[model samples]
Target: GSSGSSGSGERPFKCNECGKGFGRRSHLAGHLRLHSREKSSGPSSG
Candidate 1:
């Protein structure tokens, strides 16, 4: 029944480094790993 709340072909946040876009702010934050020098896998990674 939650069909109207869905979005398509739209991006609210943009990544300056990779020129990527996401639907939500949280999604963009998850992609920060690409620009960070931190390890790709570790306890502190998440």
Candidate 2:
């Protein structure tokens, strides 16, 4: 595992493909799929 940094609740990356905003860049990537009308094809452990 690797260590990562976290923000103090600031959404900086706004999706250029859409108008949605996100706090983390990674989270924004996932959000793009959601806006594309893609269904989640698997189950989540959580």
Candidate 3:
């Protein structure tokens, strides 16, 4: 029996744009938004 850590390759939701690994999809959600910071401007496209 050579058991080790608890987190033994448990589904890692990595970001598509960047090569970053996260524990769950919860954290990954925010990570995606960071890369595509699309802040609306004053009458720019609107």
Candidate 4:
């Protein structure tokens, strides 16, 4: 069943690296972390 709130064909935030689309900027930003390994918080990677 579709929630009807999301999973739509429209996405305002687009990732330049992978061309992925996100409904929210925060979601897009989180996805970007996967690409650049940038963390919003927590311990740094050694």
Candidate 5:
């Protein structure tokens, strides 16, 4: 629906657990939770 300049070609944030890639740092940070034993309710829990 939009142009090809959405930066889909760039994925700098990579997860070490499953090797999944993310475009934003926050996205990668959230995904990393799956590999952790502890679960956080929100950002302030950190």
Candidate 6:
């Protein structure tokens, strides 16, 4: 367990979709996928 320093909502990168804050821009960018659509194989064909 850690201290009570995260619930304060002092994040650097905030997601506009869910309004969730992240530590880094990359983290937020990755999280943004959740709001939209997840990328996988993409259009699997025969």
Any residue pairs clashing in model 1, and if so which?
none
| Residue pair clashes in candidate 4 | none
Ranked by TM-score, top first: 6, 4, 5, 1, 3, 2
How would you encode candidate 6's per-residue C-alpha lDDT over 1-46 as one tens digit per residue? 1354566667777767657777888877988776556535467676
Error of 5 at 35 (Å): 1.0
RMSD of each: 8.9, 8.5, 11.1, 7.8, 9.5, 7.6
lDDT of model 1, residue 39: 45
Q: How well is each residue in 1-46 modelled by candidate 4, as lDDT tens digits? A: 2255556587788888767777789988888787766535668777
For model 5, what is the alpha-carbon lDDT of residue 28?
Answer: 86
Give a tens-digit lDDT track for model 3, residues 1-46.
1354554565468666655667878888887787767554356755
How well does candidate 2 score on lDDT at residue 14? Answer: 75
Give the clashing pairs for model 2.
Answer: none
Q: Compared with the true structure, what per-residue lDDT tens digits does model 1 show for residues 6-35?
A: 455557897876666778999998887766
Predicted structure with the largest lDDT when compared to the true one: 4
The C-alpha stretches of model 3 lying farther than 4 A from their native spots are 1-11, 38-46
Off by over 4 Å in 2: 1-10, 37-46
Which ranges of candidate 1 are over 4 A from the true structure?
1-8, 38-46
Local error of candidate 4 at 45, Å? 25
Greater TM-score among 2 and 6 belongs to: 6
Tens digit per residue, CA lDDT, model 5, 1-46: 2344455565788777776777789998988877675554465755
- Please give the distance, in angstroms, between residue 41's alpha carbon in candidate 4 and its true position after superposition: 24
Better of 5 and 6 by lDDT: 5
Clashes of 1: 0
**Model 6 TM-score?**
0.56
Superposed by TM-score, candidate 1 places the C-alpha of residue 7 at a distance from the truth, in angstroms, of 15
The TM-score between candidate 2 and the true structure equals 0.44
lDDT of 6 at 11: 77
